[PDB]
Amino acid sequence: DDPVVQEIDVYLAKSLAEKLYLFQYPVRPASMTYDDIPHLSAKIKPKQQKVELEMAIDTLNPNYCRSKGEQIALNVDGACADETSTYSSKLMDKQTFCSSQTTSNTSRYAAALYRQGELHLTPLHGILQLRPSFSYLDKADAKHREREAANEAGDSSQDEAEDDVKQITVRFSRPESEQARQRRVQSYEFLQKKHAEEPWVHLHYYGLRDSRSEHERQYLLCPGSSGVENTELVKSPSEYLMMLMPPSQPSNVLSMAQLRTLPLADQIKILMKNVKVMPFANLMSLLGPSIDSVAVLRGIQKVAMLVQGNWVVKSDILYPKDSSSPHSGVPAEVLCRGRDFVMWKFTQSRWVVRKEVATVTKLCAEDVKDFLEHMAVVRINKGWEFILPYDGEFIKKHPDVVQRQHMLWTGIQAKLEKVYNL
Amino acid sequence: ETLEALILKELSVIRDHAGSACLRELDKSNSPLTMALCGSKGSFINISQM
Amino acid sequence: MLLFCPGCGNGLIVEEGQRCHRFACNTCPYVHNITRKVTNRKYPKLKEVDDVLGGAAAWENVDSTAESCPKCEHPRAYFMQLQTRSADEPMTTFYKCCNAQCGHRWR
Amino acid sequence: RMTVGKLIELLAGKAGVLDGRFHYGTAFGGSKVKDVCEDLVRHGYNYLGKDYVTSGITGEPLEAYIYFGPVYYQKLKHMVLDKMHARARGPRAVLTRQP
Amino acid sequence: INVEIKKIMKANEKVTSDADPMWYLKYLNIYVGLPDVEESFNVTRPVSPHECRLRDMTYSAPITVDIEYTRGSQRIIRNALPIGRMPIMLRSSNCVLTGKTPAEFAKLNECPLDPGGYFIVKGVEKVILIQEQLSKNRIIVEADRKGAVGASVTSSTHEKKSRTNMAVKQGRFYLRHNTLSEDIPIVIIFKAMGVESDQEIVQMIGTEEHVMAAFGPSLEECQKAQIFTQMQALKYIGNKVRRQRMWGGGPKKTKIEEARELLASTILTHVPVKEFNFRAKCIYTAVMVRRVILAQGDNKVDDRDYYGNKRLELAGQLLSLLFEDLFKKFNSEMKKIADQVIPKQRAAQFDVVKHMRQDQITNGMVNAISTGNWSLKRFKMDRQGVTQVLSRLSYISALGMMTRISSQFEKTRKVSGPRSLQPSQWGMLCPSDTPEGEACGLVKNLALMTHITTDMEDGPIVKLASNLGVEDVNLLCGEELSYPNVFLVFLNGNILGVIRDHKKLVNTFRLMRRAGYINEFVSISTNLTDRCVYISSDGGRLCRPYIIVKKQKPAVTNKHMEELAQGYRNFEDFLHESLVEYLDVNEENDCNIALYEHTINKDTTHLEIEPFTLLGVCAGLIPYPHHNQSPRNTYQCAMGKQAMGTIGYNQRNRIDTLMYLLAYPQKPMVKTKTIELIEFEKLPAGQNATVAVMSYSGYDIEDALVLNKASLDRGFGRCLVYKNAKCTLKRYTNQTFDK
Amino acid sequence: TEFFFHTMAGREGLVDTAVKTAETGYMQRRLVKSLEDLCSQYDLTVRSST
Amino acid sequence: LPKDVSVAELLRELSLTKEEELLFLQLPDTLPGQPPTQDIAENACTLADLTEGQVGKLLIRKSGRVQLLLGKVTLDVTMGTACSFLQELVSVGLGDSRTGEMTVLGHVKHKLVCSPDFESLLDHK
Amino acid sequence: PGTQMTLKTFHFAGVASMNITLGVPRIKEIINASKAISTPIITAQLDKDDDADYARLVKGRIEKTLLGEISEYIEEVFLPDDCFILVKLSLERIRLLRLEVNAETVRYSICTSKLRVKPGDVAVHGEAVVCVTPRENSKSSMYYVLQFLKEDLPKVVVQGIPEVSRAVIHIDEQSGKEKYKLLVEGDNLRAVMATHGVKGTRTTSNNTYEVEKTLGIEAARTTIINEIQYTMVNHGMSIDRRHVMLLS
Amino acid sequence: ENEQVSRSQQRGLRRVRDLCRVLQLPPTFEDTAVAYYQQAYRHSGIRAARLQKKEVLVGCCVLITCRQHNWPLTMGAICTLLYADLDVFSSTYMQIVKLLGLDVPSLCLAELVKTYCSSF
Amino acid sequence: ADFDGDEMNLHLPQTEEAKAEALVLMGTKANLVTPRNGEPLIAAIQDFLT
Ligand SMILES: [Mg+2]
Numbered sequence A: 001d002d003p004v005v006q007e008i009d010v011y012l013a014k015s016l017a018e019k020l021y022l023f024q025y026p027v028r029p030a031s032m033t034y035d036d037i038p039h040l041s042a043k044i045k046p047k048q049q050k051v052e053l054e055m056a057i058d059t060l061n062p063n064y065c066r067s068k069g070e071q072i073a074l075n076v077d078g079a080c081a082d083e084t085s086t087y088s089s090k091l092m093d094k095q096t097f098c099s100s101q102t103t104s105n106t107s108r109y110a111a112a113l114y115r116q117g118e119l120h121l122t123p124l125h126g127i128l129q130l131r132p133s134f135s136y137l138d139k140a141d142a143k144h145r146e147r148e149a150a151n152e153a154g155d156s157s158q159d160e161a162e163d164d165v166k167q168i169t170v171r172f173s174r175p176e177s178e179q180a181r182q183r184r185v186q187s188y189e190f191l192q193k194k195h196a197e198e199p200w201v202h203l204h205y206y207g208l209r210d211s212r213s214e215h216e217r218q219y220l221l222c223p224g225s226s227g228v229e230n231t232e233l234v235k236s237p238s239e240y241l242m243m244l245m246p247p248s249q250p251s252n253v254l255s256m257a258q259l260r261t262l263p264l265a266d267q268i269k270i271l272m273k274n275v276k277v278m279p280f281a282n283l284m285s286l287l288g289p290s291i292d293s294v295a296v297l298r299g300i301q302k303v304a305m306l307v308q309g310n311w312v313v314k315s316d317i318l319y320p321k322d323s324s325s326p327h328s329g330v331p332a333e334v335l336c337r338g339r340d341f342v343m344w345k346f347t348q349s350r351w352v353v354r355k356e357v358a359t360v361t362k363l364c365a366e367d368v369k370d371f372l373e374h375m376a377v378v379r380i381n382k383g384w385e386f387i388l389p390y391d392g393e394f395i396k397k398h399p400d401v402v403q404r405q406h407m408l409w410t411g412i413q414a415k416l417e418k419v420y421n422l
Numbered sequence B: 001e002t003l004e005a006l007i008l009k010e011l012s013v014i015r016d017h018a019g020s021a022c023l024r025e026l027d028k029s030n031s032p033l034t035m036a037l038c039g040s041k042g043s044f045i046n047i048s049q050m
Numbered sequence C: 001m002l003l004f005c006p007g008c009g010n011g012l013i014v015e016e017g018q019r020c021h022r023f024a025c026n027t028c029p030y031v032h033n034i035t036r037k038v039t040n041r042k043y044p045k046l047k048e049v050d051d052v053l054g055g056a057a058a059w060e061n062v063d064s065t066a067e068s069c070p071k072c073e074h075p076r077a078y079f080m081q082l083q084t085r086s087a088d089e090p091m092t093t094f095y096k097c098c099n100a101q102c103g104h105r106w107r
Numbered sequence D: 001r002m003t004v005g006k007l008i009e010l011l012a013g014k015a016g017v018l019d020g021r022f023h024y025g026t027a028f029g030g031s032k033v034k035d036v037c038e039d040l041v042r043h044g045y046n047y048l049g050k051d052y053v054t055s056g057i058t059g060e061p062l063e064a065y066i067y068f069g070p071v072y073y074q075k076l077k078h079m080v081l082d083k084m085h086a087r088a089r090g091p092r093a094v095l096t097r098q099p
Numbered sequence E: 001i002n003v004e005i006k007k008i009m010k011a012n013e014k015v016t017s018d019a020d021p022m023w024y025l026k027y028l029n030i031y032v033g034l035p036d037v038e039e040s041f042n043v044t045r046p047v048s049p050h051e052c053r054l055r056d057m058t059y060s061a062p063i064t065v066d067i068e069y070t071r072g073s074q075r076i077i078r079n080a081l082p083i084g085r086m087p088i089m090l091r092s093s094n095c096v097l098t099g100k101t102p103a104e105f106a107k108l109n110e111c112p113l114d115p116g117g118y119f120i121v122k123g124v125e126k127v128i129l130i131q132e133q134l135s136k137n138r139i140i141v142e143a144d145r146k147g148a149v150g151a152s153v154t155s156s157t158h159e160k161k162s163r164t165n166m167a168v169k170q171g172r173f174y175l176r177h178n179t180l181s182e183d184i185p186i187v188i189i190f191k192a193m194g195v196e197s198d199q200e201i202v203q204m205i206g207t208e209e210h211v212m213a214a215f216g217p218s219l220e221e222c223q224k225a226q227i228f229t230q231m232q233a234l235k236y237i238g239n240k241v242r243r244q245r246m247w248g249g250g251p252k253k254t255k256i257e258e259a260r261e262l263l264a265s266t267i268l269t270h271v272p273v274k275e276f277n278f279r280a281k282c283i284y285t286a287v288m289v290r291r292v293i294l295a296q297g298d299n300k301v302d303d304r305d306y307y308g309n310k311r312l313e314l315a316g317q318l319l320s321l322l323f324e325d326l327f328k329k330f331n332s333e334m335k336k337i338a339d340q341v342i343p344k345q346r347a348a349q350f351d352v353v354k355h356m357r358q359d360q361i362t363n364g365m366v367n368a369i370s371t372g373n374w375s376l377k378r379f380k381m382d383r384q385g386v387t388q389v390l391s392r393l394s395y396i397s398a399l400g401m402m403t404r405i406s407s408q409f410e411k412t413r414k415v416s417g418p419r420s421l422q423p424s425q426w427g428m429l430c431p432s433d434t435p436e437g438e439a440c441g442l443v444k445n446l447a448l449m450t451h452i453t454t455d456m457e458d459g460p461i462v463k464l465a466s467n468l469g470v471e472d473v474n475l476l477c478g479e480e481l482s483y484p485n486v487f488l489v490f491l492n493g494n495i496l497g498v499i500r501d502h503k504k505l506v507n508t509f510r511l512m513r514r515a516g517y518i519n520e521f522v523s524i525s526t527n528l529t530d531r532c533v534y535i536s537s538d539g540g541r542l543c544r545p546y547i548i549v550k551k552q553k554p555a556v557t558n559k560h561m562e563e564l565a566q567g568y569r570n571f572e573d574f575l576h577e578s579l580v581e582y583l584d585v586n587e588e589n590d591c592n593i594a595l596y597e598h599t600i601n602k603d604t605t606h607l608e609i610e611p612f613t614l615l616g617v618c619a620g621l622i623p624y625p626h627h628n629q630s631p632r633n634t635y636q637c638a639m640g641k642q643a644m645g646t647i648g649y650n651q652r653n654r655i656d657t658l659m660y661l662l663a664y665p666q667k668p669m670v671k672t673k674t675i676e677l678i679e680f681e682k683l684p685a686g687q688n689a690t691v692a693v694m695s696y697s698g699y700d701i702e703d704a705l706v707l708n709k710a711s712l713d714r715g716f717g718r719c720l721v722y723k724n725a726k727c728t729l730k731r732y733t734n735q736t737f738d739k
Numbered sequence F: 001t002e003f004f005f006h007t008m009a010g011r012e013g014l015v016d017t018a019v020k021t022a023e024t025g026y027m028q029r030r031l032v033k034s035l036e037d038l039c040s041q042y043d044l045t046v047r048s049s050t
Numbered sequence G: 001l002p003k004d005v006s007v008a009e010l011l012r013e014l015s016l017t018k019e020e021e022l023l024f025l026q027l028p029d030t031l032p033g034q035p036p037t038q039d040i041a042e043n044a045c046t047l048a049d050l051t052e053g054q055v056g057k058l059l060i061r062k063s064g065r066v067q068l069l070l071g072k073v074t075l076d077v078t079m080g081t082a083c084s085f086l087q088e089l090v091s092v093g094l095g096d097s098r099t100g101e102m103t104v105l106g107h108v109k110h111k112l113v114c115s116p117d118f119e120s121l122l123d124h125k
Numbered sequence H: 001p002g003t004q005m006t007l008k009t010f011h012f013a014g015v016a017s018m019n020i021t022l023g024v025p026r027i028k029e030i031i032n033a034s035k036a037i038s039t040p041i042i043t044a045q046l047d048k049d050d051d052a053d054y055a056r057l058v059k060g061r062i063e064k065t066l067l068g069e070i071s072e073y074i075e076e077v078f079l080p081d082d083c084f085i086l087v088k089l090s091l092e093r094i095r096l097l098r099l100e101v102n103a104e105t106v107r108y109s110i111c112t113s114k115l116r117v118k119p120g121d122v123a124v125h126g127e128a129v130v131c132v133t134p135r136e137n138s139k140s141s142m143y144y145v146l147q148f149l150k151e152d153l154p155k156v157v158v159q160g161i162p163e164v165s166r167a168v169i170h171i172d173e174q175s176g177k178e179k180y181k182l183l184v185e186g187d188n189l190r191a192v193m194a195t196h197g198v199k200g201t202r203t204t205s206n207n208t209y210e211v212e213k214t215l216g217i218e219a220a221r222t223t224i225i226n227e228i229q230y231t232m233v234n235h236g237m238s239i240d241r242r243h244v245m246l247l248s
Numbered sequence I: 001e002n003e004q005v006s007r008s009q010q011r012g013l014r015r016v017r018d019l020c021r022v023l024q025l026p027p028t029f030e031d032t033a034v035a036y037y038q039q040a041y042r043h044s045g046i047r048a049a050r051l052q053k054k055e056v057l058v059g060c061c062v063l064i065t066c067r068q069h070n071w072p073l074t075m076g077a078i079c080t081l082l083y084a085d086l087d088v089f090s091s092t093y094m095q096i097v098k099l100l101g102l103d104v105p106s107l108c109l110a111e112l113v114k115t116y117c118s119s120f
Numbered sequence J: 001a002d003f004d005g006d007e008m009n010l011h012l013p014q015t016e017e018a019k020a021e022a023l024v025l026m027g028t029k030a031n032l033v034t035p036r037n038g039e040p041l042i043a044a045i046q047d048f049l050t
């Protein structure tokens, strides 16, 4: 699927980044708009964005009930007080639209102005949802309560001078606990008072039909050339995947992922500890092509020996000097001597009988079995055969390694013959 | 429910026909067959199921 | 049908007006007069069934055919096998031999 | 009780003790009946377990062949020695003078 | 003992008293140490579990703590202070038995084949059973006792648990809560939750004609009253709020603010409100009412026995809750002692070091483990029978009891619903293994291959979901919930948002989890009937490994298995290379599994590892179990849990109240692979006898068997019974002793 | 799958019999406690306790 | 109304007619780029940190495949929730401390969503 | 026999429907002699047992029929003069189910314990057209009562016995002649035996209290004996009739 | 009895309890200590005393309790957990051992070494 | 019973009248049939029928 058509260029504009707000009416369908509705007031605070709109609705229209309007207007306000009136006339004229904050981090949401072949993105400073609020009913209820209080006061014709002296007892400076203080801070009244402490800012509205709308509409564009390579946004896919998903922070417990994050001297060590029989060819693939062969050789010569072309882990590597036999409890030195004798017998002849080595090393049957099961398999009628065949190509490619291994095996055989009296 | 009943009927027909075939092919002196005939323990249904 | 007012999105009810019945809201003076017929059907479910049952063809939805019942020893049969017994390890049979309307029912 | 698995285990154990092997009784797998039948026919026994058996009491052979085989029998803790309980007059309860 | 206890200490790091300010007690760090015995005078000493078994004493480790406090407004710090003793489970991190060779086990008089996993208190071995409980923070739609289709939400946070119920008794939806005197209409609650327009509420509920027809009575009942603002609805709710009988007044009016606070935190605790903003809670309850309306039609009643809604609580969470309760009680006691002592004692300075009651926590833990009763007054949790005496009849008995699970019903009523065998137990719980009697169906055993997940962090999950196109719930109205193509994404019951093309989202999430950047235990499931995408990450869930199959071929080949056998790779490498992955019940509900290679078809997502893993531990002992009746297998498991035989290598030195041993035990001839996996052949519980299948002498009528006298004479069936007789010589209060 | 379904049926039968035992015991106790005062008299008439 | 698709959407927006249209799109929280001298910790590279000019190319492939190249990676663009209520885009320009000009930019009809292509990133490395 | 009781299923008595409580629960409900029992079964014998037309006729006569079950659509019609509710009856379904119900019978069904609906409120215009005009009752009621009317009108009884919930036509496969009986899931035996076209002399039931209060203590005892013996025989175990005779 | 237990006697017995609990002593030591306290509180001169006197009496009682069952514990470690001085503690100890004359075993040196070396 | 480990009780009367009543009324030969329907219960069983 080739991107044949519509190679739209995506431009960015910072002219109206902090001045762009997304308002939506969940109760008003997209078919009907508020273009014909005369806007009266728009009270919005810069900090803690909560806009409040005052819409004007007509009365002479047949869809409006003048009697109910007069009734609700007389209910919300006083008879002829008019000092603080929600409606100038005796009719319900203003409708209050209150806003609610959708989300805090609106940086991931942007407005996309689409033109003929180009798309301009503009960040949003905030997004609010507008809903028709019912605030005149609360004021009407408060006025009904104050009328009831006035009736309770004037229950009699003339009220004598009451002795309503405010008792002189100021609130004591009681030490408030931390829990009660936190409850006061988290109380809805405290948050409402904190939001109300910010003064309102009255702004003049301008409709879509106004020329100012068309004047400011061009500000969403950015003055720039058609094709310009951006200096940023050049991270590799790996860096992107790492930055979008940041990290949080038997002896074969370490996995391959934890294996590769280790020096080769320990990687080959734990590999020879887990397998105990490893060819050089497959070891090159396991270690990786990025590692030279000379380093792998100089490392494996310290933790392994060559037998019939195959690398076998050293006895002291599997059995530390402080450990003991899990089957018999004998010290690890005798186990290492027995394993070296087994390896020497394998270097001498490919076939080894368990009875001979058991009689020579004077070890138990289970120890001899655990020794032979590492590098040999049970072959009937002949005893045991090495698990891997002869590796001649590795010997031909590295004669000095084989020579040094044989030089070490000479002393190993000397010590074994001195100990076991072969 | 009609489909479920028809499927149950077909499966049970298969079971009964297999049981009849097994009872016909079984030779005499068979201990399960003899026990099912005498009624001491078991029945033809158990033999067909086994 | 549930109608809502464009002014405040509240529920609209029917109320008799000075000249014609109209949809009105209990919170705002917004009203909407009725010009022509406005209907809202429901189309409830009709009992299309006849509730006929007991036919011998539908009754013989059973497996056992051409067996030997211990009552009249005739091919026709209607067996039921039950396994809901733990005290009694073997299963349970219920045979219904009925061609001449004998009505055989036993264990 | 349709315990055919017991017969299969018996046959497998007989084949094993004949050939010195441990046949597996793994669920939905294990050694099949054909292999143990071949082992039986190789070792000289009947391929179905049933063998020619003579009665020990009368000394005459039985009419039907008998099913012999090594089976894993396990004894339970429920023994009659710990369940036998007789009651003489004995003691009684303090509140109500009953045993 | 390594993570959760530190969080518990951090939650109660600082404790102070109201009286005498500037005084405080701050916990700096804690340690659990190694198990020791207090036999020596004020001196500890390493002690083996076998010694604790013999001496009839507990096997616990003392807790050390370093703290800081003030005596005379002077900061005094500490380094190591006892506060109690935690019982140490065997073969744990701090246990001496871990990382030991069989020779070292012999030196400590402990069998290496012993499975462990049990505490030792006063010389007896107690095992904490795996508790099974309904998953919390999830809407449950079920038929009422009168036949109505209602809903319930058990909103459980770390502090409170509230069960909000829904009622459709009169064609309209009421909400019932314990803190409310009478159930109130849902529309009044909606108006009190911030949203006042009826059109918005209807859009949030749904746009289907039948949905509006069903919700009409609720709107009519709401319009009956004059409730049209949030203040009036809050007033009505507060009028319907019970009297809590709290010493003190309300915030502002004691009538409206109390209702607001109840709607904020008390009702739907799991649903969070940032700053008194119920929009997310509004959408949640709207989706709930929509589900109730959808269930009011077709009878798609959810079933409780579905294990996708079950959770397994181990001993870890129980001990964590108990330690939290004990630490809170200790802090309250310290605060009370301070408030009693420091104000008016004398000019001298008081300090809490003189009141470090170490016997409190130790005695609480010992009693809770021994008696088995768990009493949590902070959560009203009164449980019993959690801990049980480990059955030492045989090795198989203990191995099976170590993997037991009890039910929440605890024989309250013979419902027979949960007692049945459900398909959800596939590959997770042993179907055949179950106790015979009244406990049938309420006590179960885990499968041979299973694992229980742990609690996650849910941070990167939310980040990935937000980056995968999940729109904000507050950014849109509820009408989009009525669209058929829009699906809902949640997180452990918390509503996360909406999404389109749920197939792409599920595939991307599964691929990201297989990549290794997301924990493999995080489960994702899809419900097309409810159109909801559930993301489950809480602990207690059941997961099973499965081989990933793509394009009609398994991801694991013969070469991978050869490298595994040779030691080149392990199971964790299969988990990392996207070859084997864990699947939850809810996750496998949407996936296709194949039992064998020949059964693999085009629409296959995973391959079954091994079929015989379906059975548990005891059922594995049955040779050829698929050739036998299931009640026979159940009775066989029940009898094998009581079969006599060898217990361990240290059975001779072990001194129990009752022990049964076999004179000449023999390993079975027909052995299952499970036997070799559990090393039962090393500790058999029976013999191999030549059996004849025939009737003889009429003494084998019903289940009876005739034995051979010569066989019994030569040692066949011989058994040994070991009983314990204990006596104590204690010194009383007076200076006299038993002689 | 067949083994799982067979185990389902077995457990269903087990729980059915388990409930049936207790229910039958209770109803038997009630019925015998009710019908214990009846006896066959010599005049061939079954009379109550009173 | 039947459900549309982004490719046909752009086709009818440009090929069928030349009339402009105001759109709204959701973008990932983190962009494949580094904030240039923005005083950073691998935080989210928001659009405000970037400058003007061309930043990416919208590609429309065969069979309805639509992508957005923003450098070395390509995100997938799909249709969001089809809003039916009134969503208008306006600018609240506070030219003065106590006086501001609200300009009605237009009406928003469709909603787009851009998500990183995790499959391609995992197939790469 | 409770010990040997199976608590089985699928024993629909040959109709593959009409789930009836049988066994230990049935024995308990019988011995408790409660006035109200679960799933009451009434057996009715007809005169013209060979004809299915008369069978369905008496079925519709005895079975409770709701207005919404026969009406094809009920619509709230708002007109400029006044708003009301219009119900259209499906005459095809009326003549198909052989229900002796016309517009006049539907009108007579209304005004029966429905918030004092006056006869002048309900009107008939066509053959299957019913008009219901709302009127406020002044007790917390206004002209906006069309919602309650639309909700409660389809659930009104127009033909049959209110106690009757479901009635089915069972047939017998007798070789001599195939006869039809009625199985009614109601708890009003008096109304069943009193309806036209039903042979009341051969009408049985399962509710012991209703049979008692309808036909005497002897008929109650006979019905108890018959029901106990039937329930016992249906599950494979036999009990001598003298035991249940003494119990009754 | 056990109802004529003054608030001060209750405070004293609770002090004995917490003092023997912070030392991680077996319940037998607690029983013996509360028995010794109830026995020593029978005197008129002991019951009519100050809080310092009751506290040093609790200290001496738990000291005698530990001295009984071969449990070595120096007086310094006890006075460390008491809100008083050691001189008045010793004076009250001498007074009560002169008034009661109970058995006072000698402090064993080997057990004291065993208790003291482990603290390092 | 099924002889699978089930325990059984055994009571011994301490009065000649009780012994005679047990031998006569509760005699095994005198209770070969159940009073429910007259069907005999003490009869041949498995391994005897075959
Ligand atoms: Mg038995």
Ligand SMILES: [Zn+2]
Pocket (backbone or CB within 6 Å): C004, C005, C006, C007, C008, C009, C010, C025, C026, C027, C028, C030
């Ligand atoms: Zn309105």
Ligand SMILES: [Zn+2]
Pocket (backbone or CB within 6 Å): C068, C069, C071, C072, C073, C074, C075, C076, C097
């Ligand atoms: Zn027949």
